[PDB]
Amino acid sequence: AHGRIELIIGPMFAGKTTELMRRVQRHKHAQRSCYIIKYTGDTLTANVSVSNLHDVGDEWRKYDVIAVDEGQFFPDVAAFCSKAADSGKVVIVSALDADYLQEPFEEICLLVSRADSVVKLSAVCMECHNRKASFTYRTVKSDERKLVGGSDMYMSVCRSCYETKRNM
Amino acid sequence: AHGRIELIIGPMFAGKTTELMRRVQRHKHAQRSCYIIKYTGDTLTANVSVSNLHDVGDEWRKYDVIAVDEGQFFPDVAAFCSKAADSGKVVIVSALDADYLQEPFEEICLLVSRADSVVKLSAVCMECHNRKASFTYRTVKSDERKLVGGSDMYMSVCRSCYETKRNM
Amino acid sequence: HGRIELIIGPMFAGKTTELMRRVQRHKHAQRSCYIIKYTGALTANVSVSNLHDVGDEWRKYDVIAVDEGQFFPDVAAFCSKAADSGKVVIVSALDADYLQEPFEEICLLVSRADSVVKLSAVCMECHNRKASFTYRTVKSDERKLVGGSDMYMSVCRSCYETKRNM
Amino acid sequence: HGRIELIIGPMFAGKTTELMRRVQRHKHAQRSCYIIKYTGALTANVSVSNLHDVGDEWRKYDVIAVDEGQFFPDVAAFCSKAADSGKVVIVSALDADYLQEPFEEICLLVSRADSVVKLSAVCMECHNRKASFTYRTVKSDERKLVGGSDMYMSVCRSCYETKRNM
Ligand SMILES: C[C@@H]1CN([C@H]2C[C@H](O)[C@@H](COP(=O)(O)O)O2)C(=O)NC1=O
Ligand SMILES: C[C@@H]1CN([C@H]2C[C@H](O)[C@@H](COP(=O)(O)O)O2)C(=O)NC1=O
Ligand SMILES: Cc1cn([C@H]2C[C@H](O)[C@@H](CO)O2)c(=O)[nH]c1=O
Ligand SMILES: Cc1cn([C@H]2C[C@H](O)[C@@H](CO)O2)c(=O)[nH]c1=O
Ligand SMILES: [Zn+2]
Ligand SMILES: [Zn+2]
Ligand SMILES: [Zn+2]
Ligand SMILES: [Zn+2]
């Protein structure tokens, strides 16, 4: 078929998963089979929760469209997406491009170069409430790169709020 | 404030309401007050169902962001949106731009010219399952312009399927 | 086969530059492109005051581009006819006149388009905000009045209102 | 105040045309624009082989545009420094090399950008699909190899694979 990789990035609170599911739903109206892969440690179509993509086995071959949510948590995501898109799947990934220090998730970088489409969504600055936000700020003490959570541990911020808060 | 009008259009099954709510949710993370107006005959923030916008009264003035779903059903929508955006509201509208005969909803036309932003979403062709779809085809006999329903009465189609089906 | 793409937005948003960006892409894949402008190897250009004056020349090309669509009175139908014959049709046009009222024909195109992008400009009054409207700066009440930055400026919503007052 | 906008995509997608479209918009609002290209009144232009060679000239302008960003080795840091000083920084760059591997510096920019658009081209092999990849057409294994359609073509995913076989 005509396989492809579509990538949705942006910081937290930007609605990336909502966009992902908007796209899935469109495909479902045309009767395409859709498989949604979520990340296992993360807290109505075919889906699975795994800690890596190799654990999906070959189950993905039964579907037209593969959606991968929270892509930054999967260590082998670029290769998975390329294998699937070479087999003719439409592969849709949502992921953080940047961690709380504004450093890239390397695997998502790889996907940018392999993607047919890349959209970067914004959020609204949760600090000043006046500007578009492109960064995620962690609000709890921790230095683990991976730290699963929501608005209890993070907020999205504009460029100048991210600086200000970093100083204080 | 800085008021604005954002317009989301496209045919049925394109996820316009999903996009609308994605945007609302972004504003809600920055603690903006959001009011969602739906159409009365149509079948977790502040909301109301009305048959026209004049029935909302001045209740809309209590919010930062006003979202209007199914805009093509409201006869006074352009004027409402302009009044609200002149008062400093962010106004977000989802609507069909075109009816099942591919003729414009005139009021949505007005909004295009008054909008700061206009996005037209596509669906996937529900007839051939191979192309982007920009049109809505009605699958039931009726000549009422307004005819409320879902996939039981409509389907979205690409340009050439719309023609083909029209011929048969 | 065919498609209609529409590019709208106020003056000074670069709609024609976007239209040509797209044409160029198609030229790199050896598609033939026919560009129609308004007036009162792979490419081909023409100035006309309406689309009937092009005749059937357009059928020789893969891609048809129409600039300043809001000055052509039969643009909707022309684009539909061409896209039904399998052409990629790309149109740049103002959606709104200086009174923020729609060009009716460009409305019809919105409903018939596969793609619609509305570009913005930068507010020429405050220099601080995205602009979506075109303010006329010279007294007149002719709808059509050809000109440039001497006669028009692109403005944000609130500068449009302000200027309208004073 | 400041911002970084990034425009990516393969060759023949019109990234530089989009970058200039944006610059032009800012010029209509009387913003000063400084355009930096690569080499081995309101405007100002410069060719350089790295961004250190610009010195502090860039501070005199509202908008800084950087073309062919993937040839500059210190682009990420440069753009961050400029956006922290309140500049609007606009960068066009290849995200991927002819082997579909990323330019590492353009990666860093993706994470630091307020806006990222990836443009497509039209497949120069099949002439039927959107193209997101750049295929090199001449044998070589130098990463950097300056050239045009003689040496490169933009292709869709499946034409990239096909050609890679034969
Ligand atoms: C910014 C982040 C986020 N995260 C986590 C927090 C959330 O569980 C998840 C992102 O949620 P998202 O799906 O993109 O809405 O990633 C990290 O582990 N490290 C970081 O640096
Ligand atoms: C195309 C349509 C649709 N409709 C209705 C069917 C649906 O109730 C509604 C559109 O649903 P939507 O919200 O855009 O997902 O509009 C008409 O009344 N007339 C038409 O010509
Ligand atoms: C906004 C507007 C522009 N124009 C013109 C100015 C330019 O000649 C052209 C826009 O490129 O259209 C009008 O004729 N009427 C209008 O209402
Ligand atoms: C894809 C690719 C392009 N280029 C060049 C070709 C052009 O000179 C320039 C793109 O405008 O970069 C490389 O040097 N290496 C690459 O891998
Ligand atoms: Zn902020
Ligand atoms: Zn179809
Ligand atoms: Zn202004
Ligand atoms: Zn191809």
Structure description:
The structure is a homotetramer. Chain A has 168 residues and is α/β, with parallel strands linked by helices. Chain A has 2 domains: 1-121, P-loop containing nucleotide triphosphate hydrolases (Rossmann fold, 3-Layer(aba) Sandwich), CATH 3.40.50; 122-168, Wheat Germ Agglutinin (Isolectin 2), domain 1 (2-Layer Sandwich), CATH 3.30.60.20. In chain A, 25% of the residues lie in helices and 24% in strands. The first copy, chain A, has a 6-stranded parallel sheet with strand order 3-2-4-5-1-6, sandwiched between helices. In chain A, strand 4 (65-68), helix 2 and strand 5 (90-94) form a beta-alpha-beta unit. In chain A, helix 2 (77-86) runs parallel beside helix 3 (106-114). The longest helix of chain A is centred in the first third of the chain and has 14 residues, at 16-29. Chain B binds chain C through residues 2-4, 9, 85-86, 97-98, 102-104, 106, 109-110, 112-120, 122, 132, 134, 159-160, 163, and chain C through 1-3, 8, 83-84, 95-96, 100-102, 104, 107-108, 110-116, 118, 120, 129-130, 132, 157-158, 161. Chains A, B: One of its GO terms (cellular component) is mitochondrion. Chains A, B: It comes from Trypanosoma brucei brucei (strain 927/4 GUTat10.1).
Brief digest:
The structure is a homotetramer. By secondary structure, chain A is an alpha/beta fold. Helix content of chain A is 25%, strand content 24%.
